[PDB]
Curated annotation (Swiss-Prot):
It catalyses: Hydrolysis of (1->4)-beta-linkages between N-acetylmuramic acid and N-acetyl-D-glucosamine residues in a peptidoglycan and between N-acetyl-D-glucosamine residues in chitodextrins. Endolysin with lysozyme activity that degrades host peptidoglycans and participates with the holin and spanin proteins in the sequential events which lead to the programmed host cell lysis releasing the mature viral particles. Once the holin has permeabilized the host cell membrane, the endolysin can reach the periplasm and break down the peptidoglycan layer. Its EC number is 3.2.1.17. The active site is at 11 (proton donor/acceptor), 20 (proton donor/acceptor). Substrate binds at residues 32, 104, 117, 132. Keywords: Antimicrobial, Bacteriolytic enzyme, Cytolysis, Glycosidase, Host cell lysis by virus, Host cytoplasm, Hydrolase, Viral release from host cell. Gene3D superfamilies: 1.10.530.40. Optimum pH is 7.3. Induction: Expressed late in the viral replication. GO terms for cellular component: host cell cytoplasm. This is Endolysin. Changing residue 20 to A/N/S/T: Complete loss of enzymatic activity. Belongs to the glycosyl hydrolase 24 family.
């Protein structure tokens, strides 16, 4: 298992524009197009991202390419963020994948706001962090996915995804 497979599981794969759990227009493997309520705006962002007139539909290859870019961006966002980098540097490989999953879902800024949980992860206080992470809107809104990521930080293994 790895980051790509893990996210592919959590996000799924859709080839036509769709609305995510927050009702925003998305496509592919969790690639957020826009927060605006306009479908046209979404088709516009889509074409600009793919580089052709898509008409709201993309191929598998195109989805994958977006996904690759998004994963890379996530790492790099981690590494440039002063509250995140240090955490990431302290963790082992499986747990780094759990931090990336969260950044991919909620953005760098959203995760950096889990100050207290971050501190706990840095200290390697697994159970405590797991409890603190669950006291969040993130957990109450997408509880199954959040449980998977949380178990991942708690245990340092991929069991939740096997
Ligand atoms: Cl893009
Ligand atoms: Cl969920």
């Amino acid at each position: 298992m790895n980051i790509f497979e893990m996210l592919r599981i959590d996000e799924g794969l859709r080839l036509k524009i769709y609305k995510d759990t927050e009702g925003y227009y998305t496509i592919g493997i969790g690639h957020l197009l826009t927060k605006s309520p306009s479908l046209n705006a979404a088709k516009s962002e889509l074409d600009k991202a793919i580089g052709r007139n898509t008409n709201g539909v993309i191929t598998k290859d195109e989805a994958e390419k977006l996904f690759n870019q998004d994963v890379d961006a996530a790492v790099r966002g981690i590494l440039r963020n002063a509250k995140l980098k240090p955490v990431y540097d302290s963790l082992d490989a499986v747990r780094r994948a759990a931090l990336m999953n969260m950044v991919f879902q909620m953005g760098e800024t959203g995760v950096a706001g889990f100050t207290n949980s971050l501190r706990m992860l840095q200290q390697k206080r697994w159970d405590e962090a797991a409890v603190n992470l669950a006291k969040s809107r993130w957990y109450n809104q997408t509880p199954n996915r959040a449980k998977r990521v949380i178990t991942t930080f708690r245990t340092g293994t991929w069991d939740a995804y096997k």
